[PDB]
Design an enzyme around this catalytic site. Sequence first.
Site, short mmCIF file in Angstrom:
data_model
loop_
_atom_site.label_atom_id
_atom_site.label_comp_id
_atom_site.label_asym_id
_atom_site.label_seq_id
_atom_site.Cartn_x
_atom_site.Cartn_y
_atom_site.Cartn_z
N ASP A 1 0.82 -1.20 0.00
CA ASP A 1 0.00 0.00 0.00
C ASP A 1 0.86 1.26 0.00
O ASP A 1 0.56 2.22 -0.71
CB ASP A 1 -0.94 0.01 1.20
N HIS A 2 1.92 1.27 0.80
CA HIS A 2 2.83 2.40 0.80
C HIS A 2 3.54 2.55 -0.54
O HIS A 2 4.02 3.64 -0.86
CB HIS A 2 3.84 2.26 1.93
N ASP A 3 3.65 1.47 -1.31
CA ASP A 3 4.07 1.59 -2.70
C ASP A 3 3.02 2.32 -3.53
O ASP A 3 3.34 3.26 -4.26
CB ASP A 3 4.33 0.21 -3.29
#
EC number: 1.11.2.2
Lengths: 100, 457, 108, 80, 79, 94, 96
Positions: free
Chosen positions: A90-92
């Site tokens: 998700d942080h990607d």
Amino acid sequence: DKYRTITGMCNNRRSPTLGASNRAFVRWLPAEYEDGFSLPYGWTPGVKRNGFPVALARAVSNEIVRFPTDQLTPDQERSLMFMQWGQLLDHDLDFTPEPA
Amino acid sequence: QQPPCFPLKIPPNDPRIKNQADCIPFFRSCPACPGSNITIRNQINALTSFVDASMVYGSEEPLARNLRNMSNQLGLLAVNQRFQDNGRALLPFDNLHDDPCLLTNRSARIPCFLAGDTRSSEMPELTSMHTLLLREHNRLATELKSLNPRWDGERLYQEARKIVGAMVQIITYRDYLPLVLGPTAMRKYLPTYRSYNDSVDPRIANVFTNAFRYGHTLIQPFMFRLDNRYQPMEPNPRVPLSRVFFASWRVVLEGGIDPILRGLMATPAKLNRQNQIAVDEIRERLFEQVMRIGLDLPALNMQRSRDHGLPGYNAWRRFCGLPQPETVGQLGTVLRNLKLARKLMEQYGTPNNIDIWMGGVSEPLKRKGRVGPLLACIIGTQFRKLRDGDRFWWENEGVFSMQQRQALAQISLPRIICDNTGITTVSKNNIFMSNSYPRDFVNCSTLPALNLASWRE
Amino acid sequence: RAKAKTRSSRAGLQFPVGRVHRLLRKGNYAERVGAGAPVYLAAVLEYLTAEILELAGNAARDNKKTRIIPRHLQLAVRNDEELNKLLGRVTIAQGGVLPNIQSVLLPK
Amino acid sequence: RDNIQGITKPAIRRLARRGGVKRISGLIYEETRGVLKVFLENVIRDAVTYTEHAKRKTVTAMDVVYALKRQGRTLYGFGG
Amino acid sequence: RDNIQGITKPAIRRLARRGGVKRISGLIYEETRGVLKVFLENVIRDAVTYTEHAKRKTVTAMDVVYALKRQGRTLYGFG
Amino acid sequence: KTRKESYAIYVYKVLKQVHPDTGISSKAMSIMNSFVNDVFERIAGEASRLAHYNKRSTITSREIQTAVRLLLPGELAKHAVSEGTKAVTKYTSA
Amino acid sequence: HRYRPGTVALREIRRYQKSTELLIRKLPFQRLVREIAQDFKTDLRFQSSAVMALQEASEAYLVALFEDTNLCAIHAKRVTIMPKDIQLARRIRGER
Ligand code: HEM
């Protein structure tokens, strides 16, 4: 074009800016606001949504999400790497900034 | 209540917040085109909407340059110059006007780390994953330089960048997504890859940022660390999650990232049940030390869904093609539960008003999956768009050579974990599924490594 | 003697590993049958059954019904490329046909 | 004993309608009757062979199912 | 490697002449190349599966014969 | 009366796993029984042929895996293979 | 009042592609099956399931053949199906 651009620019030939960073999200459905343009629901007290009052999110979390911790049931087929890889991916993908 | 603040009002008889005048802090998102009134508000995606290992390489050019090592010709990535975990690299430090890492513990005095994302230090586990990825890139660059000595630092950096991107894509799309969607939804929404397709929009949808928070239901209320024998490591074998938020000092000064990875690999996750949604640690004690008052992660989720102006539950049910309930009985039939449907109706009044996160996590999970039909639809659609619209997909022709593809297809998370740090015993097969010691663990002296011999120029 | 537990429970399945093993042994397929072949066959059969039953149940729900009939099985199979390829030369009783009309015949 | 005419013209027309046919020529019916008779003859001959091998006098549903599966026309729902 | 163009237009014309075709439109060469590619992909995939099961690195004629036979295309003359 | 074995209770258990509130008729159960028998016979016959080709006298899980690879089309096969492996490993642990 | 030609035909196409029943009367088909089987063995009996299975197989075969026949007819820039279309479909399928 041997490697990726850091900003992801010019990945699509038709629309080079499509898919890059620092652009607007894609709306799969038209947005709904309490004023119609930019006012979030629950901004003005007494405004009913579809003939119904707008619930307090904290109240919903209090009645529905809340559960006593002592009956926590562990997952018998997943590890915490599941959660960690989900968060990392998700942080990607996305990050929505807000004013400081 | 003035812009850009959208605080959460406290309802009566609140078990934690007695003072009704108090409000949970909340800031609205940055508009796409500020200064307009005739245009509908849209939010900004600060990161590249691609699976390109951008959590460590940055998404902006100045930050991307700042992350690399410019004091050499090996094309490495900068690491911490002052702290090392048993002689192994750590993430480079960051300077900020207001650093929550220092606020967590003044005595230790360790600031937040620096990586491709600003959220890389919320918990020690995310920092451990980031450090592992950084170590893997550095080791790949070193082995590529030994493999090809004529290569320049920029060439080594770009090649290791491509390798790490393909590694992340392979691990994700081969191990993680099937365990989320389940076999049926994965087969429906992510069929066999065919070829690149430029008529596909790879932009992240607005709802995805709210439909990918299902992982908030898998959070355990404790952080577990294990020793070399996978036994409770002293001191503090288990730590409350309220005391590990932004506590970067727990990485430098508490044995490094090996115990954290060992705890992650050998600890079961939390099962999402219709009566056990999320734990109280993230509901009443989120960011307790840094903030004046604790936060409420689910309430933040619904409030952010309202702020983004996303439609209701029934609109998404219709969009994905599922039947749309209207009454209490239909909602109970859809959710396969009557108490929960009654509570949802008594709090919202109509299924059209239920928030996307509430409807997504209140649905019964798929078979061999961890999301309901609606969340499965949204997530599968998003990841299919991401894969089919990416021109640098690892399986695309010309991105990698055939022998390079065969070499890459054999990678695995346990190999990286036991190759880039001191752990020797790792889980086997799907690392996301093995959580019992020592029944499903190996020595990783048997599983093969990555054969770089196909990278000869 | 300990309490007997079925082999399909150890593998975490619903289809019977013991019956599949007996059918492999009695079916004149090979002289010997390994210990892990019945588990693999039971897992594959259970997977295929679950897939087709899920599709048929979705088709029944789209029709506002509660019980699966052969029409729903036919609609599930014929609307899926892989399942249609697996069952290309198979007739399902009381299944009907998939509704389609050639564009040439429609009024213009 | 001319029961091949029991397959009436309206029945053939209904079978053509289910197949998506809009207009039907007048000589289609005799051709369809011949085709059906050929198919039935093959299948019933195989089924009767299967029945005779078992030294039975009734043609069971399983004989028909096996006869169909021989031609490559597996049928689900009758028998096992 | 664009070796599908190694199946030339005169070769396709010869294969059509053996099939009894008198006149040939100019657009069937690409179609024939696509058809041949699909057929070869199926048969070779099955043959390579048969080879990999035996832990070999050489595709034998028996693997091709079995791969054809399991598609209902029995071939006589190669064992 | 002679007992007639069938794959009925197992199909019903799987159906209750997938759709807990959906039933099934008798003709549909007959069709599912025929489907299970057909797929079993296909996979077992292919595995037997594979064993005979390589001059082996044992049907192992590798023969079953290769038969599933040969018979099931495309993505189906892949998923099936995974499921099968996922079982055997578990069966070995216990 | 009178519908134009081809309208009731399309209505019937839509009606019979939604149902699952059998489109041939059962008694004439049973008589035909018995007459055909008379030429192989004398004094033969049939289970009801045997005749029903034969009817299902025959109807499925004829419907598929008519689909192929419709394709052949459309190929020749026509709307009606003629016996030549049936013959071409059967010959290409390998039956003749
Ligand atoms: C395990 C501990 C975690 C903590 C303490 C945490 C904390 C947070 C917080 C406080 C936010 C901002 C709340 C908001 O305004 O929306 C956030 C955002 C988010 N988190 Fe988490 N999170 C955790 C795990 C996860 C996991 C496992 C996932 C996914 C699998 C995830 C997905 C997201 C997403 C999609 C957002 C929205 C990003 C945005 O809109 O900018 N989080 N996280």
